[PDB]
Design a protein around this motif. Structure first.
Motif, short mmCIF file in Angstrom:
data_model
loop_
_atom_site.label_atom_id
_atom_site.label_comp_id
_atom_site.label_asym_id
_atom_site.label_seq_id
_atom_site.Cartn_x
_atom_site.Cartn_y
_atom_site.Cartn_z
N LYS A 119 40.81 43.45 39.87
CA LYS A 119 40.26 42.25 40.50
C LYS A 119 40.68 41.01 39.70
N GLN A 158 36.67 36.73 37.46
CA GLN A 158 35.67 36.04 38.28
C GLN A 158 35.69 34.54 37.98
N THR A 159 35.59 33.72 39.03
CA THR A 159 35.71 32.28 38.83
C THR A 159 34.68 31.71 37.85
#
Ligand SMILES: CC(=O)N[C@@H]1[C@@H](O[C@@H]2O[C@@H](C)[C@@H](O)[C@@H](O)[C@@H]2O)[C@H](O[C@@H]2O[C@H](CO)[C@H](O)[C@H](O[C@]3(C(=O)O)C[C@H](O)[C@@H](NC(C)=O)[C@H]([C@H](O)[C@H](O)CO)O3)[C@H]2O)[C@@H](CO)O[C@@H]1O
Ligand SMILES: [K+]
Ligand SMILES: [K+]
Ligand SMILES: [K+]
Length: 192
Positions: free
Chosen positions: A169, A172-173
């Motif tokens: 992935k 994460q922002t």
């Protein structure tokens, strides 16, 4: 097999990037504006970096920039990656750490690559470590030529704390503006 999910990771981590060094950023709302040689770069704050960056002018920052789309729309602005610049603008490393990359190459076989990884910044963002380590792995270890599955990068600190980037992935922002002391990095380990 190469899923679309993997292809999308290749696309993200192949995005153009650059960095800006030792300059001011002006915060309005949750956007920090940098101007360097008359060119504007707007950066979004959406995590703990909202507590770090002051409203208004902030002097002597560095920024690691990955544009989020093309082109000029505000939703395409880079996210996080702001740090305090080094105490001096000297070119020397501030830390050097072991990078260990262990890859399953078959049912019974593993390849292990052990190298020095240079750290230049006293304060470094998880954004930059994530993007640049993936760049290394894409370039040297065929990352995303196969399904990443549960592969991960782990950055371990001298106090035993660690930070993990799961390779299946994007980072994460809300973690992109998280920062650490580059000199307190002990080692980096990658399992592929
Ligand atoms: C639904 C969702 O997006 N939820 C996220 C959390 O992510 C989910 O749970 C995770 C445990 C994992 O299963 C993930 O796949 C899920 O989507 C997210 O939780 C973080 O996830 C990352 C991996 O993506 C790490 O596991 C992180 O843990 C650690 C780390 O190893 O990096 C633990 C470590 O002890 C801690 N270090 C400290 C405290 O010194 C670090 C550190 O806090 C961060 O790296 C700083 O950015 O985190 C999980 O915390 C969660 C937090 O980002 O947000 C949503 O809830
Ligand atoms: K495709
Ligand atoms: K060291
Ligand atoms: K194996």
């Amino acid at each position: 097999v190469r899923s679309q999910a993997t292809q999308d990771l290749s696309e993200y981590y192949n995005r153009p990037y650059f960095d800006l060094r030792n300059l001011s950023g002006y915060r309005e709302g949750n956007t920090v504006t940098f101007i360097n040689h008359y060119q504007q770069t707007d950066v979004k704050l959406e995590g703990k970096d909202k507590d770090k960056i002051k409203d208004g002018n902030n002097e002597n920052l560095d920024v690691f920039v990955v544009r989020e789309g093309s082109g000029r729309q505000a939703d395409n602005n880079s996210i996080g990656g702001i740090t305090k610049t080094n105490r001096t603008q000297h070119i020397d490393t501030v830390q050097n750490v072991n990078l260990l990359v262990s890859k399953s190459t078959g049912q019974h076989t593993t390849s292990v690559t052990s190298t020095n990884y240079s750290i230049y910044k006293e304060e470094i963002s998880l954004k930059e470590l994530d993007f640049k380590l993936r760049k290394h792995l894409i370039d040297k270890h065929d990352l995303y030529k196969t399904e990443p599955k549960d592969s991960k990068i782990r950055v371990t600190m001298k106090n035993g704390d660690f930070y993990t980037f799961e390779l299946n992935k994007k980072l994460q922002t809300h973690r992109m503006g998280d920062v650490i002391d580059g000199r307190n990095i002990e080692k980096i380990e990658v399992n592929l």
